[PDB]
Design a protein around this ligand. Structure first.
Ligand SMILES: NC(=O)c1ccc[n+]([C@@H]2O[C@H](COP(=O)([O-])OP(=O)(O)OC[C@H]3O[C@@H](n4cnc5c(N)ncnc54)[C@H](O)[C@@H]3O)[C@@H](O)[C@H]2O)c1
Ligand SMILES: NC(=O)c1ccc[n+]([C@@H]2O[C@H](COP(=O)([O-])OP(=O)(O)OC[C@H]3O[C@@H](n4cnc5c(N)ncnc54)[C@H](O)[C@@H]3O)[C@@H](O)[C@H]2O)c1
Ligand SMILES: NC(=O)c1ccc[n+]([C@@H]2O[C@H](COP(=O)([O-])OP(=O)(O)OC[C@H]3O[C@@H](n4cnc5c(N)ncnc54)[C@H](O)[C@@H]3O)[C@@H](O)[C@H]2O)c1
Ligand SMILES: NC(=O)c1ccc[n+]([C@@H]2O[C@H](COP(=O)([O-])OP(=O)(O)OC[C@H]3O[C@@H](n4cnc5c(N)ncnc54)[C@H](O)[C@@H]3O)[C@@H](O)[C@H]2O)c1
Lengths: 296, 293, 293, 293
């Protein structure tokens, strides 16, 4: 019973592969055609557009970079909504503006289908293993159905409320993360410059009120925690570019809902600075490197 | 074998009581005399100055508000250093500027005594139960001795390095808390205004990369968590005034060490505002009230 | 030769009046109908919708609050673009998102008309006297035509580039204004609290590298300058609500163009908080009153 | 009638030269001895310490980098106060912590001399020409005397109040400058990236509510204005190191007076970072370079 997948990059590729592990035939499409080559070999069908995915697939998933990509993929001249069938389940696991999710939801429900935002927590690793967290928004009746499908790609699938709530939950956590990580980087930098041994300061933080996931699970000072991007030149990880994108969404939503985010705004600008300054492909925890003094 | 205690407020009072529970005679002093009244009843000796505590006590503890108070309590005209005895152990568990800790350390070591900064993590509750964390700085040989004494008032006593490193650790930790608490607050306020139930957003933060002490142990959003100040109009707890003082210490250390603290600076200024806008006596998680429309 | 005017609030009312002073018949429309009553008395024609202004007016001006208002006024079910005539000149002097200006520009050009964003500098006063500055974007050949019309309402009309550049010019200015006003407020408060007389600190600021329009022309500290809003409890002036709206524009355009605006972002949030804390109707210079204890 | 001058760097050298232009014999000292070599050739006396300046000079001026330097130059083992004479006039035109100015003032007054803080506005250019602004604090009777002397080096000499008020004034002006300059840079960077022509955007800023000294006299965008550091790769001018120093003085005063400074703090932190990143030897207007992609 076929499943449609549109967009097969860093999260999409392994996500799409796990659906094949659980035994689903896929109808693939991607605007970068090289990205599909691997799937045509696996036995799966590659098509020429989103509309052509919809014409053959009763329920579809979309893992695209940002809002304009989803607007295009769905509403475009050769988009999904041009040939989506009655009662179809469309799931967008991209991270995009919630307002845009609702807009798409209105246009899908106009077509007699169901739409659900389902952005993801966890990176390329969790994507492969299948331990991603899905934050799901939409008509609650349909959540049962979506859980069946999303559970193949992920270990946690949480209902967040109406369409848009999934994006809002993703965006809020990333903002807190962004803030806490820059904070850890600063507390750590100040302490080291005050004479403390990083390993000990990190200990003190991690047993006190300062403790957070940044300090205890993703520590940005090299030589403190093994297994994290700081141990490995901040390679791979979750990309500064993406942190900045997600922060940018938080800024858009903060402004529109007239929500003051003092620390969040600055987190956004710091990451935006980092991207213009050669950190864009480095892990977001490399904010510590950015704070840390250069020699003369 | 007598122990000297100078400064008996919110942390000092219960700390001093726990030393009595483990069976130490106390030589009490406080510039606010009413604060002593309770101890003169318990059988303890109240004196007229710090110098007079030092004249009678071989090892002393000081729990004072900030730097100027410690500078006065020690170096003052009738301060400790006027009558401290050879080989005495002086411990300052105030949260003050590290630089000032070193300056006192130099003046104590001049007098042939030992000084150690030992600021505390945990609030009034931990103080009473005796589960405070002490972050201790000073000459490492002396740490053994200090652990013996501090362990009566606290459950964790950690060596941080040379004199000043304890204040360094307390100050830094409080900055991360402030940044994170305001962070959690901004995040929850955002999500609520985007139409999320707070109990569900907290769940998500807490099973995710956002998780931190502020969000999973001290949530600032009324009705999310039992047994926290947001459950009770932000009474008690750790006060905005004190938070703001501590972040001031961070700001000044950051300046002195030339360390960029962008968020830390905002955190400082936000709590300074709250002190001016009637939050001074509320718990610092009340920053969420301050952002909430 | 008729001129269409949509939206007659604080800037719109006096702008519309100055076009009557130079001798133009007006075709008025406003979603708040009481706002029109004054013009039906002057002899001018009030209509039921923007579309109905278009049906009667060869060149139209729109002075609306923000983006969605322009999007609706033009593209709406009974909007301008429903009945606009070949070769018409449409001028939007609202302050809105540049991106939205371009979008309307494409939609107007599709209908064989000309569109031009022409936001304004100067307040209600400049509006009345006719000394507003217009920042104008659009196809440069059409600038001559627009200057003829806008010059009735304003004393300076400057070409900024393609459609969107006017909004981008207004938005960047109001961002620098906001940053500098909060700066002046902060600097003055710091000096006052450091024991300076405010009038002296202003003298110094205004003869030195700190001088800016905020300090030498619109000074936020009551009693430093006569005739500025701070001399009359921040009544009238340029509204805190609108400044936040404009800073929201800067913010969202900074995001879209990936432009780091650190102080700018803070300015936005500070003004955001003021709206929620009882400054929304007060002049934007009231940030001083908001900082002061 | 001899004048003592201690510290002959970027401001000191030309200041000291203007005193020679008005015809004063100078008794020079500087911890960097090469800095003196030029004055030994002019006929002036170089000495081996501040104390040795005081032994020969009835009224002295000190143009040093920061607080510790003044503390040392005055109170040091071979400092001024070791051999200052009755009724002498000591003037410190360094930019330092006001609290430290008062401390010195008390120590000078104890020795029967007068002390006056007199920090300066205007850079290396105004220094040479003699158009610097002096902001003067101290006992008001003595202001007459100091004006006679300072007027040789500067065109404006303003009384600010008691000792420390000069520093107070310098420090709040510079904080406002930092905020506006970063503001301008942010404003200009955002306009450019929204596609404006810079020369135009500056024109608009400079005829609108955004206008300020930063944008109309010292515009950081290369090629908008002639004559400013941004025309010459940000060489010379007013160094990022010193701006960061002055904003550290604002910050520490801001904390000490419990004054909220959200933007001044950010300003401080930005300039801090720029010093960490090889902007230190560059004029402070180089903040535009730093934000720009
Ligand atoms: N990478 C991570 O560690 C991580 C973690 C959590 C969440 N996310 C979120 O997941 C989303 C995508 O992650 P990713 O790293 O796989 O992105 P990606 O860019 O690597 O993959 C997206 C793919 O979509 C394709 N695409 C773009 N527009 C399209 C269109 N109109 N039609 C068809 N295909 C199109 C691109 O060719 C690309 O291969 C983002 O929104 C991101 O915020 C990423
Ligand atoms: N309150 C908390 O939850 C908490 C937690 C950890 C650390 N701290 C830190 O511990 C320190 C004290 O906290 P607190 O709430 O007990 O303060 P407090 O005001 O409640 O207690 C201070 C006491 O010291 C006295 N005092 C002031 N100057 C004195 C002097 N010169 N000589 C003798 N006594 C003097 C005061 O009269 C008062 O009784 C602070 O530095 C604070 O930041 C507090
Ligand atoms: N007020 C000032 O001092 C000042 C100064 C310079 C620039 N501005 C800018 O001018 C713009 C508008 O200023 P204002 O004070 O006139 O705003 P305003 O709110 O006072 O007036 C706008 C009017 O438009 C009407 N309106 C709203 N939606 C409409 C619609 N869809 N169709 C037709 N009419 C509609 C409203 O009823 C209202 O009366 C803002 O973007 C602001 O930034 C204001
Ligand atoms: N540079 C400017 O455009 C400008 C403008 C206004 C105000 N200021 C203020 O002026 C002050 C100094 O300005 P500058 O640019 O000449 O600095 P500078 O570094 O060029 O000059 C300082 C001089 O004093 C000497 N010195 C340092 N410590 C000494 C000591 N203990 N005893 C004797 N000499 C000592 C140094 O060797 C140096 O020659 C600063 O405090 C700054 O904020 C500078």
């Amino acid at each position: 019973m076929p499943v449609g997948f549109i967009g097969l990059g860093n999260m999409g590729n392994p996500m799409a592969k796990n659906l094949m592990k659980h035994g689903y035939p896929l109808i693939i499409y991607d605007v970068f055609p090289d990205a599909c080559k691997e799937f045509q070999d696996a036995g799966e069908q590659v098509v020429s557009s989103p509309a052509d995915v919809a014409e053959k697939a009763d329920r579809i998933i979309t893992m695209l970079p940002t809002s304009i990509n989803a607007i295009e993929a769905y509403s475009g001249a050769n988009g999904i909504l041009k040939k989506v069938k009655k009662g179809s389940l469309l799931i967008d696991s991209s991270t995009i503006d919630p307002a845009v999710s609702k807009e798409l939801a209105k246009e899908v429900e106009k077509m007699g289908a169901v739409f659900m935002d389902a952005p993801v927590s966890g990176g390329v690793g969790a994507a492969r293993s299948g331990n991603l967290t899905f934050m799901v928004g939409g008509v609650e009746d349909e959540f049962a159905a979506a859980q069946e499908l999303l559970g193949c790609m992920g270990s946690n699938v949480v209902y967040c409320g109406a369409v848009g709530t999934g994006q809002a939950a993703k965006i809020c956590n990333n903002m807190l993360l962004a803030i806490s990580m820059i904070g850890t980087a600063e507390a750590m930098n100040l302490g080291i410059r005050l004479g403390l041994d990083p390993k000990l300061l990190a200990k003190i933080l991690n047993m006190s009120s300062g403790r957070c996931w940044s300090s205890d699970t993703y520590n940005p000072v090299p030589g403190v925690m093994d297994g994290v991007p700081s141990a490995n030149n901040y390679q791979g990880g979750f990309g500064t570019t993406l942190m900045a994108k997600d922060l940018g969404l938080a800024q858009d939503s903060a402004t529109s809902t007239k929500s003051p985010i003092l620390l969040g705004s600055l987190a956004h600008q710091i990451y935006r600075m980092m991207c213009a300054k050669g950190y864009s492909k480095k892990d977001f925890s490399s904010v510590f490197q950015f704070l840390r003094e250069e020699e003369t």
